[PDB]
Amino acid sequence: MREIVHIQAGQCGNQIGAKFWEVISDEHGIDPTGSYHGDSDLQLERINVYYNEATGNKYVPRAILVDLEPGTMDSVRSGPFGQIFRPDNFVFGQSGAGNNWAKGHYTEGAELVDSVLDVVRKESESCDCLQGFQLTHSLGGGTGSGMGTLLISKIREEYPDRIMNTFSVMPSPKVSDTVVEPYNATLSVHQLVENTDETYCIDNEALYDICFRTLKLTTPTYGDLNHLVSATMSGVTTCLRFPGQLNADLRKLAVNMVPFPRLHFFMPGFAPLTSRALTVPELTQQMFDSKNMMAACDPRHGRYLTVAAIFRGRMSMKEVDEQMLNVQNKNSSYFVEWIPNNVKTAVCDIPPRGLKMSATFIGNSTAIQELFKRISEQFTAMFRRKAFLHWYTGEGMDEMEFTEAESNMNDLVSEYQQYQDATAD
Amino acid sequence: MRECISIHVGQAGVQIGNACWELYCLEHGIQPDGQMPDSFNTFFSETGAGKHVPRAVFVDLEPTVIDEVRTGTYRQLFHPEQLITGKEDAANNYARGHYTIGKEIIDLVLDRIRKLADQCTGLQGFLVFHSFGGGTGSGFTSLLMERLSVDYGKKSKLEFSIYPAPQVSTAVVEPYNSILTTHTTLEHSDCAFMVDNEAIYDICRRNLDIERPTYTNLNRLISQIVSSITASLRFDGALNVDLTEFQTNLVPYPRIHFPLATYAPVISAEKAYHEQLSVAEITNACFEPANQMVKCDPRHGKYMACCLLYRGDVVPKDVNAAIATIKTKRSIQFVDWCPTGFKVGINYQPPTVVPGGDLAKVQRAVCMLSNTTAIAEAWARLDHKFDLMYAKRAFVHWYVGEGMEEGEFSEAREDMAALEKDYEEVGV
Amino acid sequence: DLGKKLLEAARAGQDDEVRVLMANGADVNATDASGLTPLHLAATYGHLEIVEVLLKHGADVSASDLMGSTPLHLAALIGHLEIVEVLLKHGADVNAVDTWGDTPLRLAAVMGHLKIVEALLKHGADVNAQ
Ligand SMILES: Nc1nc2c(ncn2[C@@H]2O[C@H](COP(=O)(O)OP(=O)(O)OP(=O)(O)O)[C@@H](O)[C@H]2O)c(=O)[nH]1
Ligand SMILES: COc1cc2c(c(OC)c1OC)-c1ccc(OC)c(=O)cc1[C@@H](NC(C)=O)CC2
Ligand SMILES: Nc1nc2c(ncn2[C@@H]2O[C@H](COP(=O)(O)OP(=O)(O)O)[C@@H](O)[C@H]2O)c(=O)[nH]1
Ligand SMILES: [Mg+2]
């Protein structure tokens, strides 16, 4: 039945996860009590992918809410859709992770991990045919980063034949909670490279840049940044949630989007960039523009290994095809010649809320190395001076673990460079 | 009796199967419930109640496509045991279709095939419908073809294979699945009819004036061609009366078993009253590359065999006069060791179309089946795409993680290289 | 050992302990095994009051550890603006180069500490020369 199990960990993970649920519930016609009130049968056709059927024609998100900080329970439960979640799916600790990856991965997180897995098991066992897991988290904190990656590795050992998909929020000094963010993110990337099938790189640096460019914000709130995350999350899951020409799940997406196992970090994009009707050529140009990417990398500095594009709304499907082929013909140098027909387009008749037409971009680009280089350079600046190292070693971590994570991220950067320079011999 | 069992594997196989059985019912006068107000007994079994049941098996690794058959217009035509579904698909991965996922349903599928075979008194063999591109269409078909060669050693096996096209919803790994299935099926198939999605797309756009053809539009055209090929097995003519004859008439060299099908006329139902096309006009159209099922240049190739299958108001002397003109005005080069003659079949029933469909009802139609070395161009297109990706080992990890050895990609490509050489050797 | 105690107090931000140890003869310029002084530690960990107290009682503003790191490099790396301004005012070498070839400006820029980048440039930080 192609069910997905959704997990949200830490402060960022729960904030973006709640916004995803509010946005997709609106699209599917599901109110906060779990009742359906829409006008289309297409809204309920694939409802089972994200929602469990409850008593008396009600729908309940297949969602697990995790945090080491107790205050997260309260904020979610007080949100507009707070009541929609199953109360026994809230797995919360009391001490917090103090923005420390080691606390999330080895201490507080290791103590709560079994309780989460019991909830994951209960949801998984009730699925007719589990597609896989979707995890929302930041890489810059302690819980989403440390505990999220511990959870991923434990799920990978218990469900080895199921897809692991993440929506991973990359830290930026432009939007920063602490200077230990490069350590937390590097330690996490190392885990993501090995244990996830596909990761959507949601870069806080790119979110800040979009908000500055579009709303002239030098001081955006997490609400401003999250508007872009929820629009993107809705767009990238369109073909999982809605009936259409496409007969596909997360594995089929991973198969066609990931040519090399480690190179599974996507650069998401979105058009039009609104705030809290464009023509098909305008949507297409905007979708391929550096200014519309949710990862702070210039696509023009690399090459696309693979591209997926999802158009939503009533538009000329002939115009979409012509526009997509035009991008590939006129700008052949930005796509690898050794993966034939590596740009795929899908069209969904249903547009998102407050928009008549939209386009969602999913790029597997070698330019993503710029994001990893940025984190690596900040990691190295901090690690060379051993600043804050006792926070991690005090939790039992060894300095070699830092050196190893550093080397693996640099190996990932060199792998992207190798394919960027590869020729179709 | 001389029964033929049709097997539809994966989405493309099942959907084309739907269009074929819809058209067979209309041709034979069978209603969607199996009732009829017999030469067609080769394809349809008959119950005590007078219900005509297709000798068909439908297999898919995920249930969505077959569920539409189970609840649609023809829900009472097939018995539930003939419609087999798994829970998880092959996710465009040949290795999942063949190894990991396929191994879980193979025995059940063979058990269901055996139940149909037991109802036969003179089983000729099988007609296998599948895509080259899908993980199920590629992987599961090759596993089933391997098992059918062991379990039914003397039986003929023919294929109707959907060849991938960028204009028609292809996927990036489809050139791999195509080469993988071709390699493993080659020694288990007697004759295979490739259907290039781009050729069908081109015909629908050019002749039916459909800008963006749906799977329904494409499949109604494919079923019209498939029916033209299987008519001889369902109406008891004088040409291609048994599955064995397809090999005898079209395949002098066993590995070179891919005949080019050319069909005419394809006319829009929504176009102004036109004077009906003569035998000479529809025959001339058989040598027009635009009417081929597979895109290739036959002037670059040599003919090994050629069959012309007419349907409707077709006088034998008019066919003989049309063929005489073709040996004069046109340059049809046969290989120095082949008879040079054209084999002719005529079925006098007026051609049948789906009521309200895109195709106009015609007085006379023709399907030419020619074994030409020009079809090697379609193998070269797939091989080039395979080569680009394989040189970098792009996507190979997905296959290796699903019970397949990496060496199988090299063994498959070497076999394709030998097949391209077989064509080149015959072509001179 | 008073030296070890003052290094710990400056790192932990124990304002009262720092003043008590210094009254007992604690070496204001004591070093740990890596060459870090109480001023390096107070500058890294954002203890402004301790930075000011150490500077008033003989702390070397431009002391180098074994890797050539000065308190200014560390304050600029971690992003402590007020500490950066206090060190500069007390004569910290704005263009000090550590073993990796980094200056305080380079560290502030890599870590995205824009206000510190501005403050360093205003106090004569040389961008084109290390
Ligand atoms: N002509 C035609 N081609 C089709 C149809 N459905 C799919 N295809 C083609 O078949 C290929 C995809 O293979 P599928 O048959 O859909 O997939 P599958 O065999 O079910 O296998 P998996 O989904 O990978 O498990 C592409 O090249 C499609 O264009 C159809 O109804 N008609
Ligand atoms: C469940 O959602 C999706 C699933 C898939 C695809 C996709 O992008 C259009 C999706 O939407 C984001 C997909 C992606 C990329 C491909 O090539 C790069 C491809 O060959 C093929 C595809 C898909 N197939 C087709 C014909 O589009 C199958 C997998
Ligand atoms: N985009 C976005 N980033 C957030 C949000 N909340 C926190 N962050 C980022 O997440 C990182 C801090 O991790 P956080 O999730 O608060 O910590 P955790 O609770 O220990 O996982 C920093 O990079 C923050 O900028 C949010 O709602 N949206
Ligand atoms: Mg399928």
Numbering used by the authors:
A (entry chain B): 1 to 42, 45 to 278, 285 to 360, 369 to 441
B (entry chain A): 1 to 37, 47 to 437
C (entry chain F): 13 to 142
Lines from the paper:
We previously selected artificial binders to the αβ tubulin heterodimer (tubulin) from a library of designed ankyrin repeat proteins (DARPins). Here we applied cycles of randomization alternately with selection steps in order to identify higher affinity binders. This strategy led to evolved DARPins that bind tubulin two orders of magnitude stronger than the parental one, resulting in complexes with subnanomolar dissociation constant. Biochemical and structural characterizations demonstrated that the affinity increase is coupled with the destabilization of the ankyrin C-terminal capping motif (C-cap) of the DARPin, which in the parent DARPin interacts with tubulin but needs to undergo a rotation to avoid a clash. This remarkable order-to-disorder transition illustrates a new mechanism for affinity maturation.
We wanted to characterize the affinity maturation process further and selected for this purpose A-C2, the DARPin variant which gives the highest signal in the ELISA conditions. Fitting the data with a quadratic equation (Equation 1, see “Methods”) yielded the value of KD and indicated a change by two orders of magnitude of this value to less than 1 nM in the case of A-C2, down from ~125 nM in the case of D1, the latter value being in excellent agreement with the one determined previously by fluorescence anisotropy. Therefore, we also determined the structure of the evolved DARPin A-C2 in complex with tubulin. The comparison of this structure with that of tubulin-D1 indicated that the structure of the complex did not change much with respect to the DARPin considered (root mean square deviation (r.m.s.d.) between tubulin−D1 and tubulin−A-C2: 0.62 Å (967 Cαs compared)). Only a slight difference was detected in the DARPin orientation: once the tubulin β subunits of tubulin−A-C2 and of tubulin−D1 have been superimposed, an additional 3 to 4° rotation was needed to superimpose the DARPin moieties of the complexes. Actually, the main difference between the two complexes is that in tubulin−A-C2 the two C-terminal helices forming the C-cap motif were not defined in the structure, as in uncomplexed TM-3. However, in contrast to the structure of isolated TM-3, an ordered C-cap would generate only few clashes with symmetry-related molecules in the tubulin−A-C2 crystal; these clashes could be avoided by a different side chain rotamer of two residues. Taken together, these results indicate that a destabilized C-cap is a characteristic of the evolved DARPins that contributes to the higher affinity for tubulin. Remarkably, because the C-cap interacts with tubulin in tubulin−D1, the total surface buried at the tubulin−DARPin interface calculated from the structures went from ~1825 Å2 in the D1 complex down to ~1260 Å2 in the case of the A-C2 complex. Therefore, going from tubulin−D1 to tubulin−A-C2, an order-to-disorder transition led to a gain in affinity associated with a ~30% decrease of the buried surface area.
